[PDB]
Design an enzyme around this catalytic site. Sequence first.
Site, PDB file in Angstrom:
ATOM      1  N   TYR B  16       0.863  -1.168   0.000  1.00 20.05           N
ATOM      2  CA  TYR B  16       0.000   0.000   0.000  1.00 20.05           C
ATOM      3  C   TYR B  16       0.903   1.222   0.000  1.00 20.05           C
ATOM      4  O   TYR B  16       2.006   1.190   0.553  1.00 20.05           O
ATOM      5  CB  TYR B  16      -0.929   0.017   1.214  1.00 20.05           C
ATOM      6  CG  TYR B  16      -0.158   0.060   2.502  1.00 20.05           C
ATOM      7  CD1 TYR B  16       0.229   1.273   3.057  1.00 20.05           C
ATOM      8  CD2 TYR B  16       0.221  -1.108   3.147  1.00 20.05           C
ATOM      9  CE1 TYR B  16       0.954   1.324   4.225  1.00 20.05           C
ATOM     10  CE2 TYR B  16       0.945  -1.068   4.319  1.00 20.05           C
ATOM     11  CZ  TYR B  16       1.310   0.151   4.853  1.00 20.05           C
ATOM     12  OH  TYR B  16       2.034   0.202   6.022  1.00 20.05           O
ATOM     13  N   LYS B  34       7.788   5.529   2.786  1.00 19.43           N
ATOM     14  CA  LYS B  34       6.543   4.884   2.383  1.00 19.43           C
ATOM     15  C   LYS B  34       5.477   5.934   2.645  1.00 19.43           C
ATOM     16  O   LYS B  34       5.184   6.228   3.808  1.00 19.43           O
ATOM     17  CB  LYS B  34       6.267   3.595   3.157  1.00 19.43           C
ATOM     18  CG  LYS B  34       5.050   2.821   2.619  1.00 19.43           C
ATOM     19  CD  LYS B  34       4.692   1.568   3.430  1.00 19.43           C
ATOM     20  CE  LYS B  34       5.631   0.397   3.189  1.00 19.43           C
ATOM     21  NZ  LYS B  34       5.502  -0.205   1.826  1.00 19.43           N
ATOM     22  N   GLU B  82      15.568   1.753   6.411  1.00 20.09           N
ATOM     23  CA  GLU B  82      16.887   1.659   5.809  1.00 20.09           C
ATOM     24  C   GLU B  82      16.705   1.446   4.318  1.00 20.09           C
ATOM     25  O   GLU B  82      15.778   0.755   3.886  1.00 20.09           O
ATOM     26  CB  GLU B  82      17.670   0.481   6.387  1.00 20.09           C
ATOM     27  CG  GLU B  82      16.976  -0.857   6.131  1.00 20.09           C
ATOM     28  CD  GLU B  82      17.648  -2.033   6.811  1.00 20.09           C
ATOM     29  OE1 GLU B  82      18.647  -2.544   6.266  1.00 20.09           O
ATOM     30  OE2 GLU B  82      17.157  -2.468   7.872  1.00 20.09           O
ATOM     31  N   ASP B 128       2.980 -12.486   2.720  1.00 21.97           N
ATOM     32  CA  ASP B 128       3.173 -11.913   1.393  1.00 21.97           C
ATOM     33  C   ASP B 128       4.602 -12.100   0.889  1.00 21.97           C
ATOM     34  O   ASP B 128       5.138 -11.226   0.199  1.00 21.97           O
ATOM     35  CB  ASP B 128       2.797 -10.432   1.370  1.00 21.97           C
ATOM     36  CG  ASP B 128       2.420  -9.950  -0.018  1.00 21.97           C
ATOM     37  OD1 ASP B 128       2.076 -10.798  -0.867  1.00 21.97           O
ATOM     38  OD2 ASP B 128       2.460  -8.727  -0.260  1.00 21.97           O
TER      39      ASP B 128
HETATM   40  N1  ZGY Z   1      13.485  -0.390 -10.779  1.00 22.63           N
HETATM   41  C1  ZGY Z   1      13.038  -1.247 -10.165  1.00 22.63           C
HETATM   42  C2  ZGY Z   1      12.475  -2.349  -9.374  1.00 22.63           C
HETATM   43  N2  ZGY Z   1      12.831  -2.211  -7.956  1.00 22.63           N
HETATM   44  S1  ZGY Z   1      14.377  -2.413  -7.521  1.00 22.63           S
HETATM   45  O1  ZGY Z   1      14.624  -3.821  -7.493  1.00 22.63           O
HETATM   46  O2  ZGY Z   1      15.169  -1.574  -8.366  1.00 22.63           O
HETATM   47  C3  ZGY Z   1      14.532  -1.804  -5.874  1.00 22.63           C
HETATM   48  C4  ZGY Z   1      13.478  -1.958  -4.989  1.00 22.63           C
HETATM   49  C5  ZGY Z   1      13.593  -1.482  -3.698  1.00 22.63           C
HETATM   50  C6  ZGY Z   1      14.760  -0.840  -3.274  1.00 22.63           C
HETATM   51  N3  ZGY Z   1      14.922  -0.338  -1.960  1.00 22.63           N
HETATM   52  C7  ZGY Z   1      14.080  -0.385  -0.904  1.00 22.63           C
HETATM   53  N4  ZGY Z   1      14.621  -0.256   0.325  1.00 22.63           N
HETATM   54  C8  ZGY Z   1      13.785  -0.320   1.363  1.00 22.63           C
HETATM   55  C9  ZGY Z   1      12.430  -0.500   1.189  1.00 22.63           C
HETATM   56 BR1  ZGY Z   1      11.274  -0.591   2.682  1.00 22.63          BR
HETATM   57  C10 ZGY Z   1      11.935  -0.620  -0.111  1.00 22.63           C
HETATM   58  N5  ZGY Z   1      10.595  -0.815  -0.369  1.00 22.63           N
HETATM   59  C11 ZGY Z   1       9.966  -1.177  -1.594  1.00 22.63           C
HETATM   60  C12 ZGY Z   1      10.385  -0.600  -2.799  1.00 22.63           C
HETATM   61  C13 ZGY Z   1       9.776  -0.948  -3.991  1.00 22.63           C
HETATM   62  C14 ZGY Z   1       8.740  -1.860  -4.024  1.00 22.63           C
HETATM   63  C15 ZGY Z   1       8.324  -2.421  -2.841  1.00 22.63           C
HETATM   64  F1  ZGY Z   1       7.308  -3.314  -2.885  1.00 22.63           F
HETATM   65  C16 ZGY Z   1       8.901  -2.109  -1.624  1.00 22.63           C
HETATM   66  C17 ZGY Z   1       8.413  -2.750  -0.362  1.00 22.63           C
HETATM   67  N6  ZGY Z   1       8.183  -4.055  -0.391  1.00 22.63           N
HETATM   68  O3  ZGY Z   1       8.216  -2.073   0.661  1.00 22.63           O
HETATM   69  N7  ZGY Z   1      12.770  -0.561  -1.149  1.00 22.63           N
HETATM   70  C18 ZGY Z   1      15.811  -0.692  -4.181  1.00 22.63           C
HETATM   71  C19 ZGY Z   1      15.698  -1.170  -5.472  1.00 22.63           C
END
Ligand code: ZGY
Lengths: 261, 297
Positions: B16, B34, B82, B128
């Site tokens: 979300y 977020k 982080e 999830d």
């Molecule tokens: N382009 C492209 C595709 N994404 S990526 O692989 O480059 C990549 C995704 C996340 C991060 N970093 C990161 N650090 C902490 C958190 Br908390 C966080 N959260 C989320 C971010 C994105 C989607 C999510 F669902 C979440 C989640 N599950 O909260 N993301 C860095 C690179």
Amino acid sequence: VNEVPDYHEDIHTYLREMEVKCKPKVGYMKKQPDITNSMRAILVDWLVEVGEEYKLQNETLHLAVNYIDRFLSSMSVLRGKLQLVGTAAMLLASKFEEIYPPEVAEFVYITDDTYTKKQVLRMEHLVLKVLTFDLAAPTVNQFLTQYFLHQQPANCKVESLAMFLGELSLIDADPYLKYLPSVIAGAAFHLALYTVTGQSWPESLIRKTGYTLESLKPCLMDLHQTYLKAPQHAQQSIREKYKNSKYHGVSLLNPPETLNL
Amino acid sequence: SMENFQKVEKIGEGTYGVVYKARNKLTGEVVALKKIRLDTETEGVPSTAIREISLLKELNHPNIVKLLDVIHTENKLYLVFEFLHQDLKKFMDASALTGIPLPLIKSYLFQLLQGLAFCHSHRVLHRDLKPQNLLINTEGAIKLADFGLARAFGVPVRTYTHEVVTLWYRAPEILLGCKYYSTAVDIWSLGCIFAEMVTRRALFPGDSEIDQLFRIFRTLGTPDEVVWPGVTSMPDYKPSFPKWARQDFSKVVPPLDEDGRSLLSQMLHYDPNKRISAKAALAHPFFQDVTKPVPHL
Ligand SMILES: N#CCNS(=O)(=O)c1ccc(Nc2ncc(Br)c(Nc3cccc(F)c3C(N)=O)n2)cc1
């Protein structure tokens, strides 16, 4: 395995820690200018009515009561706003525990439009800020459900009566704020066991929790007095709730005259 | 504190709300946000955010995203975590030709099992688990993320929400409409991910509930009363289900060794009572030579 054993112990231990951190201030009602223990009892009785009205879980009511106690420990509240707090907490627990929590409009309705939707949402905001989002608090119900597993052949009446006593403990801030949730759960379990079967606090639970019958004795005495005086107590919604066959009508059982402790 | 942040870019959308990559102007710390546009005249603070924050304040573990702060204004809500470098799905895609080396897959699975064991020991169900919610850094670590669908369970569990797991990683007991469900579901998810790490393609990429069930059946065999006592009595069970024979895992996951195949078989067990626990999986012979290699984004 639906009574998850492989991580079983750890969980209990963790709760025994968390219940210490979430404890409200014992004498907070003495610092509140405008409210008394009786007003809090009325609020909790109304919350029981609400939970039965919308068929909410007992854990939700326990969480709401815990939130209210923790909020009132640091915030002075006038009587005309007390319900609002008790509403927002009951909302928050519903969002935390219930699969299909009642929507905000329903909570505003059950207050008989005493407050507005804006007021309820803002009180939810304030409660979240005050409690620092520590809403996963251990409850008497969480310890009761674990103590139930140690029954020699399980009894529906024992479970229902223990849950009934656990809910009764929520009404009276004095003296039940003195005791930890695990202690209240143990006292209620032993009281139900002695009332129905005559058995005592089992050895397995002594090993698991470390509580002895001697250690539980004061909570046993207080809860026994509450059980004996329950029919004359000004708040009666819990007894009516436990009259139903859903809890086997254990509210109208004859309490023992003495505990032989 | 929210004037103290420089949004660098949009990362993606989670369970979300929107997630941003941002930097702290005063400390230089790079973090992930977020953002949740709350509202008024609405339901208010969503249960997903409430559960996420309340549970993550309790879950301090190296393999679980650290929640640093919650910036709570009357209009929006911001969670601060982080910042990790990448999620597992992009890493898989970039490696769909070269593949993830066995030591790295083993280290990642070991860390994930440690994190899930911590979560289960703290009466938290993730519900999830999937590559999008598995974040990696440049130092070889991996962390569980996005507990928006997570919820704290109790000893003997009661009936919980049914419409909970990403389809490809949904345990069979959920698809069959079982009344009580437990830690096992999470284990199942990791199992799929484990296979998805070796083959570099989804183990059970179903497009519907029945297709997911039938793929699980065709791969592991259609369950009966022997392998899974009680399956025939579950609400969404049909005796008209096709009866497929179980496939030898040597064909399901070729590049996997004997110990890895044993671990995967114990993770994908039909009976949740029989399915291996994360705590027990950490002691599997598969992890005796565990290391911590570097991913090299
Ligand atoms: N382009 C492209 C595709 N994404 S990526 O692989 O480059 C990549 C995704 C996340 C991060 N970093 C990161 N650090 C902490 C958190 Br908390 C966080 N959260 C989320 C971010 C994105 C989607 C999510 F669902 C979440 C989640 N599950 O909260 N993301 C860095 C690179």
